[PDB]
Structures are given as structure tokens and as C-alpha cells.
Amino acid sequence: KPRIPVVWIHGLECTCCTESFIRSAHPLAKDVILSLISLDYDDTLMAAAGTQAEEVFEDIITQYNGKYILAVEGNPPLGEQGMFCISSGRPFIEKLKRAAAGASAIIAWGTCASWGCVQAARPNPTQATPIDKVITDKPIIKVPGCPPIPDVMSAIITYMVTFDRLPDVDRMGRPLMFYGQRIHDKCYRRAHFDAGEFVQSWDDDAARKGYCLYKMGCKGPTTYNACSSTRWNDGVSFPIQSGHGCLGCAENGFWDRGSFYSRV
Amino acid sequence: KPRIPVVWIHGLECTCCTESFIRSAHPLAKDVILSLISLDYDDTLMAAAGTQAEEVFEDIITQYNGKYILAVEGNPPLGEQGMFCISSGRPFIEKLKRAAAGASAIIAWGTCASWGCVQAARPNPTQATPIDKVITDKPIIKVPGCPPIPDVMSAIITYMVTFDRLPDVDRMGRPLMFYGQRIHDKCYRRAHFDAGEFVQSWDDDAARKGYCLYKMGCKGPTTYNACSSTRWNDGVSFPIQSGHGCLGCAENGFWDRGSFYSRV
Amino acid sequence: STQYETQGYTINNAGRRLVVDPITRIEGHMRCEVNINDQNVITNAVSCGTMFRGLEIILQGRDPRDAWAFVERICGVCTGVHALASVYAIEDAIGIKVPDNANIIRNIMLATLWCHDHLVHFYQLAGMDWIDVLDALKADPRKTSELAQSLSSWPKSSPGYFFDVQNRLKKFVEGGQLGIFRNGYWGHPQYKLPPEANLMGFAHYLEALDFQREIVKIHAVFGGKNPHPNWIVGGMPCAINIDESGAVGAVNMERLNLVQSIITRTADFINNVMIPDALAIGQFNKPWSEIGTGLSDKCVLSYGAFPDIANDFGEKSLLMPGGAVINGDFNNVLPVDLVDPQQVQEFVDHAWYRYPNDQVGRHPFDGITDPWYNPGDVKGSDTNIQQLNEQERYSWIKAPRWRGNAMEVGPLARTLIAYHKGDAATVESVDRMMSALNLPLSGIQSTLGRILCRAHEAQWAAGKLQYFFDKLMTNLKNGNLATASTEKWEPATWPTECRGVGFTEAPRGALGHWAAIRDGKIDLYQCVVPTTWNASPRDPKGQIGAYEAALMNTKMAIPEQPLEILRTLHSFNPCLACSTH
Amino acid sequence: STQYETQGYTINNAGRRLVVDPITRIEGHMRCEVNINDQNVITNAVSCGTMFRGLEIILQGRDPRDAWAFVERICGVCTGVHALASVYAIEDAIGIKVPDNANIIRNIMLATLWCHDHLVHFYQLAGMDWIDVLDALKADPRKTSELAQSLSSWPKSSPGYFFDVQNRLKKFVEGGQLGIFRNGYWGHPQYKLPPEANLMGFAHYLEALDFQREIVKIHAVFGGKNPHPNWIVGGMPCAINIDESGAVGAVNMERLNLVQSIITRTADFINNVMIPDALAIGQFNKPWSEIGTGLSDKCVLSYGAFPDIANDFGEKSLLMPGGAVINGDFNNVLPVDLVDPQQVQEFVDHAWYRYPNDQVGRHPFDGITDPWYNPGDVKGSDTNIQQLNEQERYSWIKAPRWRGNAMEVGPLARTLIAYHKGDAATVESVDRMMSALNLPLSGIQSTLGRILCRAHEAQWAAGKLQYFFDKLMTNLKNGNLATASTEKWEPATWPTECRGVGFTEAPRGALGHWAAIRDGKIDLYQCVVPTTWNASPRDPKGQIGAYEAALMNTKMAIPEQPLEILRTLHSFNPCLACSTH
């Protein structure tokens, strides 16, 4: 019984979203690849290189025209005629457009593909641009975070495979299931926020009792993600649980909202 | 090097604390038994029965007099001359007193041993009585909950072995590390409590968004335990996360504080 | 001394008396006494529950909605099953119908418990009766690898692994701190496994001790925690939200993915570790297919379980069949009605309770729990018992009967019932198992058979977990999310007076809770639990229960070492807290 | 065409030009071109980084306390190492000393990353250059089991396991959806493993893909999440509380128990899966001990890492040695100073950047990152590179040199430095490894050697995890809980102008961040990263970097199928995001 074809391309990025994907605990990434999807192109993991990889790309997008899902990690730079990110000797944006044209839908993994992320922070030397500003005629599901939570990534994939539909999204294209609520609306330190019980300096007595990180710059109050509920790495922790405020990393423009250590 | 001798006895109980113990994820209960302690008597797991089990009990409490830790699960009944719980044809309380006399310290696992638990709820047919009302001359560390969290049990054990001392306790004898704060002071639904966002009937829209369970009877505001932080079963869930209010199961008398579905 | 006949046995209390108190590697408090003749053959057996708490008393005056939480604490080993029976009983009384997803999730909770309980019992409770742990130290690791690989595809079988396990055991015992192995029965002539099979089994005991913790993560997702998950009258509290805002606050796709991962792992472990080990025990212990028959060729009982049609507890709905066989007539599986006052009754003429007439049985809707510690003319005294007097009251366990018959319950009972009702999967499984052992079908009616059937059932339950999970997902794909019915949550909606029965098949057998509600409160709450059946004391006719019957006629190699007694008792998986409640 | 001599090589761009773009099974974007002569031997090699983001530009104007978070996003593969270098740099600038526990925890974070990165590289990135996955379909499962059991004590070795793996691969391939295996090099004559070794290796690929997720749970405990954990200037944010109220809000005994459990499992996997597989690859591919030497017998560099004495970055503190060798003179390991402007310099005469004088190298405190895409005459256009022009600018990667020398960095470089400084553990490990393969010491200076050294380092790092954990627990037993210094947290406490260097050994080699602070903000932030060294383009003297050198002189069996090029490139573990930043 065939598996849905998936093409995973990479623009300017750090590869954290691919690494997050392989951290998935349930389903294991192994079982996603072997049983749930056909991961038919992916530069990080595939055997073929060079001309052999270009043949795979061309063959899949032609054979499965209109039927594959395009996963995109990273983003295209518009500066230097696109040659800040070069793929087979040509601008990455050309590969992005070719892959998008045949896709039934696009998953924009991470803050890079969704919004811009660190390369788009001031002064954005490469004119890094999110996917939805370039591809304007396809369904794009934004799954932001730097990177998104591993088990969120795999849950979105299993939802789509099991239910044979895209997740319902908010006004920004984020799946409601994991991005509908703020970090601060499901944070286990909220009792302390409400009581005015704050960490004031690192490793103070308040920190050693798990008090709220608002005065240390936590951006939980303005950030939509699942970190405080689903948590990270098979439920082991999340930023706030290990003592650092949320940076806001799922939100558009979070690098340029002032210092991470300045209050919301 | 020799491992510290431990004698684990069972009064009136349901065996949930023993089951909780074997659920430990880190360290595995296997590794606690093989490498950390010498579990020298335990009716649930030991090979020997009857006269052979009685010989183990006698030999260990004699050879290691003053040097073993006594773990107690369950409690003694005072009714019917103690014969609501019989061991080796005599009241359990006689075994408790004999075991306690040789112990260096006693761990009261669970609400049964700590406080009384379900058999002591009204009208307490057996006159079930917590350990510290019978044994008044030994250090007793209360580890309440019905049962306590598996990885709390194992963390208390590893603390004691590693640091070679009893954990520091509150005024009720509960380890401060895990019982110093209320469930409600580290609950991820506290945002909703503070906003007046409550489940009003099961499976309403509020319930489907993970709103606060206060109006459904949650006793988190009066209950000290680690369930909302450490969580249960290797961090997978806790009562509130799965949609039921806290019953108050770590607190003395929790069965007789009114219905579980009446507000705190 | 006296002698009398019952159920084809000659019950004779002359001769030497042996006492086993405490029975270990069970849940709770049990004492067993036997008489043995000159030939070291048991001629009398006495089953005594040595604890009581009184949940049926404690439940009086409580809100029915709270009852599940109290009765769940009957037992932490079969954790969850009393909650299930309770919500069934209260729903039956009030007239509540739960949504399909709640029923499916309850079925998942029960199947999960079957898998967990059956696995832990096999290794941690019964295993050391069959596996000589110390004899594992004499095994050759290569030969152990070869044996394991001949029996299973399980990956963990290298000679280096078995050497490492053997060396861990060698280090454990080197300081003379033998722990749970101290003063065991090691070297007894009834230990029949070769050293390599002992090492294989001991390695698996450790693998199972580790793995069992994973199984119950399913209970944590739906029920919050294990032990002692949460439930509600009206369904389950674990609201589902797959595709809407706030799914982070509910059972969502990530939670369901976790469940699926545990199901697959559980099935893998059961099918590739437990099942081949149960067969190996069979292969090396075939004489035990003729020991410990007891009531299993006479009278067996199942209520049935796992309603596949929500709120329908009939024969077309229950995936695990119900029925009763008496008089050894397996051609006549009889229907069970838990409301019929002439079917399930409890007697207390040999138990520590008061009835107005102790020569008759009481159906649970007429049940009485009035404790009365009166051991009578014991050897010793009432606080220092040397020998119970089984001619009078000798246990905290009431004596249930079905139409006056003493019955065995549990995995073997269920297997026999399903087989003889013609359940295709059961017939195929049993036939293949007995064929592999070259034993007749009658070989299942024995101590060895109880163990084999329990392992069978773990495989069956792991398969049903997947089935139920797939049913849940089909509902969610169809937009059917409901998990609770609340139209009769409030007490003012209930009948002023009503009564109900909740029943299921717990891991150890047929479970029932009978509840009467009056004026919003529990007026009566009576439980009859599987070990109450099996560990039952005698009735006014002198009829013996399942344990006492199974022990009858057993040869002991060494009277002072109760290995044969332990083997047979452990084959039932006794839960004494359950039995007495 | 032209020819010139450098570093013992004849660089000749006559003959057929081969292009490999994209290079896959790396992080990020790389293009490689070579020329081959009439004997299909490489006579020219061109390394090109095909991406740039500009973190050094983005960091200007940031608060120094925030810098770690930005530069962490240089790379998600070597996640955490740039944050560590950043906090070290800012602490060096301002004059901050962290508490011992913070240092220990940072060392745990780094060792965790080494374990993870080395493991995933071996299997998921490099593995398919050595293992013919499709050939695994021809293996005999029993002979696979026998092979595995001869190499290791690892438990998972049964014939049924290998059959199950093989069968799953068969079902995966059978419908033609080969996924990551499509259009691979399967059957190439340089695949030398027998089918059983291919199946064993593929099984292990899958096991490693599953297991690697566990290792980073250590990062989640101390750093919140992986990828991209959190850090602070002044120590770590993971406050510790073992025995006081509110330990539920901090790193407590349960959290530490989780860390210990992961450490043990990590060591077990590396020692019993990765190590034997690396040695087996060596046994079956001995000719690759003579291929891909490159600069590894000429010039190698380590800065050193893992300060064991908190805040002391000198030779007596660093557990991983630093030093430099040039001119093939391994008898004189030279000291490295990252502030000396005559030591580390970067050139851009062959890179897409502007300097006022491109014939000179700039120390990073004088660094300039002014991007200038200027490829000259490629065959093609500015937006269609058919052939890079390596006589002019051909990469987004700057060219670092050390005292004007082109250096190799990474596991092989570190191993050589430690060996020749006389580190006893290293001398003993290396000598025993080469003895096992019946190869001379010089066989380590090769593509095969890079792989072997990385595997050995994973073992070393797993050991050091336990050492660091034990050191933390010792401090806690002595009541030393501090994790942060905050005396100089506030900007009003800082020097008006200051500069600092943070350095370490990332998995791929020597990493430095140079930071200048003025008026509370970053004035300059320059990074020189291990793949910058290794993948470097040429300098004004025409000197070639480590990748180009390693490719020189290599025989290709089938020019159109670049397996030999991939093997050598992948042996360095290229990270192109790191290289370009």
C-alpha cells in the first residue's frame, strides 16, 4: 500500500528542524520514514549526491506532480540575486519554486520557513524571506519554533496521514492544535506570576524554588506554542522548567523584540 | 561493598505503593534492588514463604540490628485485638513493633502508613491507625500519596543512599524536596483558575481546552505533592492533566473532606 | 480428626499439619494449612484470608459518583478494575449510557491492566516457582543464547548478554546479601529446567521488571496516573481535542501517538518473551499438566467482559465470553444473571462475619458485612494461632457460590468457557498451544494450564488493545469526540431509589459490584471479587473452594519446603486485598 | 589549464571536470568540483560553501548577554557549542568567573553533544558510504547473528531480529518507494563489506536513529530543550535544589537520576554498537588507511577543551589537549594563542567577501564580514554556476590559517595532538586500535583514520560524562550548589570597552568566538569555526585547505559516481552552516 511522497528541501537554515524531527519519541522518526510517508528527497539523509540527487528530485516532482507534500526548512535569500544560497549552481529560490509548483501542500517547518528567524534579524544581510512571501498559490502550514517541538512535528505528520487532511489553522497559518494557546496560559509557574513571586537574579532563592521568570525577561506571555504542556524531548523539560525564560522563539520577529532579558 | 539492609513490611494496604515503586524509571527498580540497597525482606517479591520467610525476617533483624531501614506499607488495625491483620498467626502490630525496634529509621510509604488512607475513612471499621501513632521512638519519614509518585519514591531512596542521611522534612515528617509546595502552586492550569476559566460539566468546551478543574472539585489548592511538576509514570501525566481534579490523596483525612466533586 | 467426602475428594485432617504463613509472592495476607498423610500427599487444605478493611461499610452514605475512587483502593495490583466495575454499577443503577469513546477507552484501560498484571505475575510472582535462579549461575552463556534463539525471534539473546546477566547475579550474591533469593527452595527436586533455561528465564524476569513500567503509560494518558487512575460516572474525564485551539489541554494526536507506541511495544514483549517462556516451562514441566486440577474439570465461571457495543452487556457485545459450567459438563455452558437471587450467593458459616442465618447464602443485593472475629477452638489462642479450626470459622474471605456450586474463576476458567462456547480465536490458540506441548486438551485443567492460559490471555489482550485503539481513531476520523454523558450527573436527576450491578473480568476472574442508591447516597455496596471465589472457605455442605480443591491430592517431595503448594496457589495469582476488601 | 605546486601537491586543472552539487549527508550547502586525469585520479579539488547568513553582522549592537542565543543558531547539528563559546567569550571580555557547578554542567553539555553528534554522524551521515544497504537483502540472518556475536556483547543479535530487519527492508523497497535509498551507489566496487556485515550495519543504523533521541535528554534537563538549549553569561540557569522546599521547581534528585540513567545507556550503546562497527569497517576497508591523508600528516590544530578547573583555560586544566603541528613535525607540538595577531588569520582573496587588501590575512579582532558575491567567469552566469573559477573567488567560506599554515582540525587532529603530547590514555588507545587492525600508526592519517578517531572520541566523551556527573554530585554532597555568578550581570558593572575570546573543541574541531564590547553592546563578533578551517578555499600563496588536500591524488573507479569523494568529505563531518555563519 503506497506511502505519501514527501520532498524535504533546505534553504538558509541551521538544520535544527531536521534534528528536532529525528528526536521524535512517538512515532519514532524511523517508523515515520519506514511506514507512514515516503521521504523521497532530503539532502541531510539521502544516499544520492550531486547529479544522482538532482535525478531523484526531478523524477519525484515529475512522477508525483500534484501529489507530493513539500516540506521546507529554512528560507530563500533575495540578496545577491539569490546567490546567498546556491543549489546545483543556481539560486535556491529556483528549486523552491519548482518544488512548490508540483506540491499539493507545503509544510513550513520552523521559524525560518515560517517567518525568517535569525538570518532575518536586523539588519537581515541576505534579505532572507519566509516561504509564504515567495510562494503565494499553495496551502502553507506554518509550524514555527526554533525548532518546533519534536513530538509536535510528528503529531502534525500523523494527523495529516491518519485524517487525510491538513490541520485547521489560525489566522497566521499555524495549526490550532499546538499553537492555539500561549505558553503563559499553560505554564506551571503561573501561580508564582499571580502571587508576584519572581526570580530577580540568577540562582537566587526564588530561582531555587521555581518562581516565575517574568522579571528575567520571559516572553511566555506573548508566545503561542505547546512547550508548557507537551514539553520537549519526550516530556522531559522545557525552557522555563530548566530555569530560563521563554525567548519567544515561535513568534515572528522574536529576535528584534528587545533583549531576551528585558520584561514583556 | 555491602549494600544497606532494608526490611519492607506490609500491614493493611492495597499494595499500590509497592506497585508504584516498581514503576520507577530512573533508577529502575531492578537497579535499586541489585545495586543500591539490599532488599532483605519483602512479602511481595521474596522467594521464601512461611517458615522460610520467618527465618529470613528473624535472621536479618538480628544480624543487622540497629543497621537496617524499615519500609512500611499499610497500617495496623487496633480492632479485634489486631486480628484484622494477621501474620504468622499473630497480630500484624507485633511484627511492626519487632521490626521497628531494630530499625535505624522508618520510611512510611503512602497515605496508609502515613495517615490511615481508605481503611481509616469513616467509620473506620478496623480502627486502622497510622504508624506514627504506634511507633513513637524512631525517626519516621512520611511519603504520602495513594500511592506516592514512582520517581519520588526512588529519588528519596537515592538521596538517602547518596548523601547518607534522611531527607529534611516539614513539621509533618514529609520530605521538603517533594512535599514543600502545593499542587496548585505548580499547576499548569493555574492561568485558567486566575482568569475564572473553569470546566463546569464533563467534556464541555472548557474541558476540551484544558480549563481549571476547581469547580469540578479539584483539591489541588490544599494538597502538597509533586504531581504537577515531577508528574507520573516518567513524566507522562498527572490527574489534572488527564482531566480529573486532584482528590487530595497525599493529605491526611482526604477521604472524609466531602465529595471529590464538591469545591475546596 | 474427621473425614468426609465432597466433590470427589476425601477431606481428612488426620496426620501431620503443615502451615504456610505468610504466603509470599502474592498480594496481601494469606495463610494456608494442609494435612499430609504418610505418603507426603495432601489430604486436607485450608485457605485463610488474613486481612480485612471493610470497604463495603465505608462506602455507606457516600455519594455514588465518588464510589469508584474508594473501591479502586481495594487493590493496587489489579488497579483500575474496581473503578470500572463501580462506574458500571452506578450507571446501571441510575440509567446512564456513556458515549462510545468512553466505552472504548474503558476497554483500553482494562486490556492494558490485563497485559500488565499477567506479565508481572508470570515473572515476579510465579516465576521463581519454576526457575531456579541460583542454578542460572551454572549455565553456559552460549548454550543459553542457542536455546533462546531456538524459541524466539526476540532480539536480546547474545552470548555476551547472557554472560553479563549471569555475572550481575554472581556479583549480587558474592557478598552473601541474597535479598529476595535468601532461603529459597533452590535445588528442590521439582526444579526441572536445565541451567541454560534458568538463565534465560532469569534474564527475562529482569527484562519484564523493567518493561512493565511502560505498559501503564496508557493508564497515565487516559487516567492520569498508575497505580490508581481516575474515572467518572458518565464516561471518562479525559476530554479529547484533536484539531481545535487548546488541544494542548486535552487528549490530542501526540497523546494518542504515545498510546500507539506503547501498544506495539507491549504486544512485541508479550509475544516474543512471555509466550515462549510459558511454552518452555510447559515443555520441561509436563507432569504439572496433571497436578492442581481442582475445580477446573468440574465448575468454572466467567461473567464476561469488554462490551464492544457501548452500554450493551449482552452476549452479542462482550468480546470475552461469559458463562458457567457445573458438574463437569462442558457441553452445557449456562447463562449467568447477576440479579437472580438464586445464582450468586455468599455464605459465612466458615468466615468471620455475622448473618441472621449462617446456614444460607445471601445474594449481594441482600448482602451483609458485619465483621466477627471468632476463630473458635484453634490450636493456640485467638491472638496466637498455631492451627485454624476449619470445622468452624477460619477466614476473612466470604464463600461465594453459583446456584450452590463452588466455582473456579480466572484465565483458565475463561479459556474453558470461551473454548466450549466455540470462540474461534480461543479454540485455535488453545489447540495450537496444546499441540506444541503434545498434551491433550485436558492438560489445561491443571496448575500448568493456569499459567499457560494466563500467558495466552496476555497475547489476546495485547491484540485487543490495538483493536480498541483503531476503533477510537475511527470515531475521531468521523468527528465523534464525546467522552462523557452528563445529563444525569446531578443527584436531583437520579431515581430516589435504584440499584445496579457492575461486572467485568478482572485479571484474576469474575468481578461484580452490587450497589443500591437511596436519597442520593449509597445505601448498600457489596463486592464479590475473583479471589473471593477462588480462595473461598467452605460452605454449610462442606464444599471446598478452588484453592483448597487444587491443593488436594498433591504430592510433596519435602514436607518442610512448600514448593508444590506455592506453585499451585501462585498459579491462581492470589490477591488477598481483593478477596476481603 | 594551469598547474602549480603547493604543500607537496601538484594542482592541475587539466582534464575532465566533475561537479558534485549538492553534497548530501552533510549539514547545509556545499558544492565540490574536481579535475581528474586520464587515470581517473583527482589532480585538482575545489571546496565551495554555497550558503551564507551573516550572524557576525546580525550580532552587532546586541546585548552581550543575549549573544549566546543568536550564535547558537549558527548550527542545529552541533547545537550548544556556539552558545558555550559565546558565554566563554563574553565572560572573558567582562571578567566573569562562574561557579564550579556551572563549569561542570557546561562540560556535561559539551560531552553530551560529542556523544550525540559523533554517533549520528557515523550512522546517518557517513554510514551509507561504507554499508551497501541494498546488499543487506542478500544476507543470511544466521550468519549475520554469528558475525555480530563475534564482534560484541551487545544483546540484540538474534537471527530472528536480523531476519525481521531484513524483511522490513524488503517490504520497504518492494513497491519501489526507496526513499533515502533511491539512486544510491549500491553495487559500486568500493563497497567491500560482505552481505552479513551490511545487514548488521543497517540494523545498527536503525538502532542508532532510535537511540540518539535519548542522549539529548541531558541537554533537556540542564538546558530546557534540544535542539538549541539555553545558557547564561555567569553560569547556567538551571538552579539546583536537592533538599529544600520547592525542589520541585529546580534540578533535584529525580532530575539528576534521569541524567545518570541516560549517561549509562549512552556509554553502553557507544561501547557495544558504534565501537565494534567502526573497527569492522576498518577491518574490511584497510586500503582506506592510505587514502585521504590530506593535511593530517602535515599540519593539525586543536585549541583544547573541557576545562576541569573552573575558569582556568590553561594546559593543566583542559582535559582535551590543545596545540599545533606544522611541517609534518609531530615532535614539536606548538602552543596556540588566540589573541596573537600573527597566529589565527583569515583570508578572503578566494572568498565572496571584501577586505581593503585581500592579499593579507586578518586576525578575528580585526575581522571584516562584508559579503561580496563575485564569482567571475564561471562557465555560465552569476546565477548559473557551471564551473567555479578557483583562480578567483569561489566560496562563502573564509580561509583561516595558523601562522600562515593551512591546518586540519577535528577528531583526527585532536588525536594526533594528544598522542604526540604524550597523553597516556590516547597513546594506549591509538596503539591498541592500530594493532587490532594490523596497521601502522601512519594509517590513522587517512579517511579511515578520521572515522576511527571520531568513534574513539565518542567512547572518551561517554566516559567523561560520568566523570563530570560524579564531580557535580561530589559538590552537592559538600553543600556547594551554586550555578550562577551575578556580580557582573548588570551592564553598569562592565568595562566601557573590553574584548574577549571564547574557545573550545566542537565535535568537528577548533572553535573560536572573538567579541569586542563597547558601551554595553557588541561592537564586533567574529567566529572561526571548525568547518571554516577544513572546508577553506585557497589563500594568496595558493595553499589548499584540508578538504581539497584530502581529495587530491584520489583514484575514482567510476567518475560519474562520486563515492570516493563522498567518503573522504564525509569523514570530516562537514557542517556548512557552521563554516559560513
Ligand code: SF4
Ligand atoms: S515563567 Fe514565563 S510563561 Fe511561566 S508564568 Fe512566568 S512569565 Fe508566564
Ligand code: SF4
Ligand atoms: S486544576 Fe486544580 S490545582 Fe490546577 S489551577 Fe485548577 S484548582 Fe488549582
Ligand code: FCO
Ligand atoms: N484481578 C483482580 Fe483483583 C482480584 N481478585 C479484582 O477484582
Ligand code: FCO
Ligand atoms: N562541530 C561543529 Fe559546528 C562546525 N564546524 C561548530 O562549531
Ligand code: SF3
Ligand atoms: Fe530549524 S532551521 Fe534552525 S534557525 Fe530558527 S528555525 Fe531555523
Ligand code: SF3
Ligand atoms: Fe499504597 S497501599 Fe494502597 S490504599 Fe492509599 S496509600 Fe495505601
Ligand code: F3S
Ligand atoms: S523559547 Fe521557544 S521552545 Fe518554547 S518555551 Fe519559548 S517558544
Ligand code: F3S
Ligand atoms: S489525587 Fe493524588 S496523585 Fe497527586 S494530583 Fe492529587 S495528590
Ligand SMILES: [Cl-]
Ligand atoms: Cl534542498
Ligand SMILES: [Cl-]
Ligand atoms: Cl522571525
Ligand SMILES: [Cl-]
Ligand atoms: Cl510484612
Ligand SMILES: [Cl-]
Ligand atoms: Cl488518611
Ligand SMILES: [Mg+2]
Ligand atoms: Mg464482599
Ligand SMILES: [Mg+2]
Ligand atoms: Mg567568521
Ligand code: NI
Ligand atoms: Ni487485586
Ligand code: NI
Ligand atoms: Ni554545525
